Design a protein around this ligand. Sequence first.
Ligand SMILES: [Mg+2]
Length: 301
Amino acid sequence: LVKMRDKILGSVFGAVIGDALGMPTENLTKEEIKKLYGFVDSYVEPKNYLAGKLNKGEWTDDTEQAICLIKSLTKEGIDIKKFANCLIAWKNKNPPDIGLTSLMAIDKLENNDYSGVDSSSCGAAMRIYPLGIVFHNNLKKLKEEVIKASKITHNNKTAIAGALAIAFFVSSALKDRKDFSLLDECYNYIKDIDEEFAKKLLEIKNFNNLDYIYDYFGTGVKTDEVVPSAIATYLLTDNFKEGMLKCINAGGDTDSLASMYGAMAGAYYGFKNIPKEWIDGLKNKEVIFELAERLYHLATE
Ligand SMILES: [Mg+2]
C-alpha cells in the first residue's frame, strides 16, 4: 500500500540514477575506468566518448526511451503509435548517444514500418521496467505488452526474452520477492521465447562472486550479456548502493547494466534506501518525478 509508493518511486529513480551514474563509464574497460576515474562512487564528469556531449548528472538514451514508453502507457496498456512518435521526436533531436539499433529502428518507424530491426542489443530491456511496474500482478498481460512494446524496435527473440526477464524481476521486486528461486521461475516465463537465453540465467545459480559473473557473461550491449549479469548483481548484493557500485565500475555497457539493476533494486529496496547523494546529484528530477507519479497511478489501479 504505502510501501508501493516507496518502491515505485525507488524503481524509476533507481533506473534513471543508474543510467546517469553509468554514463561516464560506458564503452570503457575496467582498467580504463580505474585510470580515468579510479573507483566511481558518485556522478563524475565524462572522459569517455561522451566527454563534452553530456554533462554529469544527466541521463542518457536509456532514460529517454523509457520516458517515451511511460508517456504511451495506460491501464489499457501501451499505445504503440504514441510510443513510436515520441521515440521519433527524441531521435530527431540529435541525441549524442543514441545507439545504432535504435537509430535504424526509429528510422523504420518514420516510414510507418513497425517490423523493427533484428539485433539482440539490450535496447528493448533497458526501457522495460515501466511495464514491470504497471503490470506487476498480471504476468500474462505483462508478457503481451512486453513483446509488443519491444517487438516494434528489436524484433529478436533474445532481445525480447531479455526484456521479459527484467520486467519479470521488476514485478517480483515489487512483491518483496528476491531470492534464487526466481531464476527457475523466470526461466519458465521466458524459455518459450528463447530456451538458450533462459538457460543462461540459470547459470547464475553457480556463481557467488560478481566479478567472475561479469567476466563470464560479459557486460557489453548484447542482451545475453548485460541482462543476465544485471539480474545477477541484483541477486548477489544485499543493499541498493552495493549493487550499483558493481555495475558502474564493471566496464562495457555500464549505463544499461546500471539502469536495469537500479530498476530492480529500486523496486525492491525502495526510494528511502537510495543514497541521498545520488538523488541530489541527478539533474532534472521534476520530469522523472512526474513520470513516477504517473506509473504509481497506473499501478495503483
Ligand atoms: Mg546509452
